[PDB]
Amino acid sequence: HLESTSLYKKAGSTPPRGVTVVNNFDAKRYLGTWYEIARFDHRFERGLEKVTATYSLRDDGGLNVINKGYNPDRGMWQQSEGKAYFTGAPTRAALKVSFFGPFYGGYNVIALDREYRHALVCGPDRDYLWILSRTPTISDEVKQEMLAVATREGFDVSKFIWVQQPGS
Amino acid sequence: HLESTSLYKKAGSTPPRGVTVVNNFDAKRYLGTWYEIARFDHRFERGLEKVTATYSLRDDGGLNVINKGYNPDRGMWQQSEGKAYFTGAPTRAALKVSFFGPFYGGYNVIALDREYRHALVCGPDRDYLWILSRTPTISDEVKQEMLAVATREGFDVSKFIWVQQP
Ligand SMILES: CCCCCC/C=C\CCCCCCCCCC(=O)O
């Protein structure tokens, strides 16, 4: 049901002790739009609701990232653009991603269903975690499964902000 | 005349296709205060006037990077403090810089005069470019030479904001 993962470490890009990263990734199936179901309180997303990330393939082998979100304190939709690159083999879902301005950090897919509908992604340490989905809501069952992996990999899931989405 | 360079390419640190990076860098001569003559504008400097960049040696072999500017909207001076490390040899003027946690960006000196009076520095893509100078103004001749290198390395110099300086 879930993609295979294995313990993976790269200095400066993965959390202490390593995390189980997807090891038979197919980047083409990760393209397009994902909704941010949940995030930890990442400084560079603070305040934002209805967040999405949209990935597209670049000529240089990286991905373009378009981040979109609504700031309820301003009543305005916002957008930013980043880049993503594999740090190693493209079958390992370990990348570096520009999360703000020119500053790149680790982006590690630590759970992924085999149909590329739902994903658990962590950053370079345990202050950075996302649940992503092809739909604006997920089932309680999918929520439990993603949370279970996060807990297994040492994250405190009570740090999640459950992001406002259509139908949420 | 300008320092010699060699092509350096690494995704996440240099722009696509690589850029020519100074290859006989002597970091001690790069220390101290530089005026930001021009920047491509981005989030973390928008609206800033009278910007200086200040580099100092760290005990750990890195550089402290301070970026200071006057923010008219706040009516205050502000500064961000960061840490930069060479990604390779210390004679290659390519570094990685962080101002917040485990998030780093590429800093690449792509033109440098041999007396360390002016420099052209790019980030990890072609949205990031700076002209730095030991003096708050530069001559037309120096300005044109920097613009020519920028264009040579694929940058669009119409994106420059010419920063308010004394
Ligand atoms: C990677 C390019 C090197 C840039 C060097 C100098 C340019 C001006 C300084 C940029 C300041 C960056 C501040 C980052 C903000 C940290 C998170 C936050 O407080 O929101």
Swiss-Prot record, chain A:
GO molecular function, one term: lipid binding
Any one cellular-component term (Gene Ontology): cell outer membrane
Major subcellular site: membrane
Entry keyword Signal: yes
PROSITE patterns membership: LIPOCALIN (PS00213), PROKAR_LIPOPROTEIN (PS51257)
UniProt-annotated location(s): Cell outer membrane
UniProt-listed Pfam families: Lipocalin_2 (PF08212)
GO biological process, one term: DNA damage response
Membrane topology: Lipid-anchor
Record's keyword annotation contains Lipoprotein: yes
Keywords: Cell outer membrane, Lipid-binding, Lipoprotein, Membrane, Palmitate, Signal
Record's note on what induces expression: By starvation and high osmolarity.
Subunit structure: Homodimer.
Job of this protein: Involved in the storage or transport of lipids necessary for membrane maintenance under stressful conditions. Displays a binding preference for lysophospholipids.
Family to which this protein belongs: Belongs to the calycin superfamily. Lipocalin family.
Protein name: Outer membrane lipoprotein Blc
Organism: Escherichia coli (strain K12)
Curated annotation (Swiss-Prot), chain B:
UniProt entry tagged with the keyword Lipoprotein: yes
Disulphide-bridged cysteine pairs: none
InterPro entries documented for this protein: Calycin (IPR012674), Lipocalin_ApoD (IPR022271), Lipocalin_bac (IPR002446), Lipocalin_Blc-like_dom (IPR047202), Lipocalin_CS (IPR022272), Lipocln_cytosolic_FA-bd_dom (IPR000566)
Cross-referenced CDD domains: lipocalin_Blc-like (cd19438)
Keyword Membrane: yes
Single annotated GO MF: lipid binding
Assigned GO CC terms: cell outer membrane
Principal cellular location given in the protein's record: membrane
UniProt-listed GO biological process terms: DNA damage response
Induction of synthesis: By starvation and high osmolarity.
UniProt keywords, alphabetically: Cell outer membrane, Lipid-binding, Lipoprotein, Membrane, Palmitate, Signal
Cell compartment(s), UniProt: Cell outer membrane
Membrane-related topology note: Lipid-anchor
Family the entry assigns: Belongs to the calycin superfamily. Lipocalin family.
Role noted for this protein: Involved in the storage or transport of lipids necessary for membrane maintenance under stressful conditions. Displays a binding preference for lysophospholipids.
NCBIfam families registered for this protein in UniProt: PRK10477.1
Subunit structure: Homodimer.
Protein name: Outer membrane lipoprotein Blc
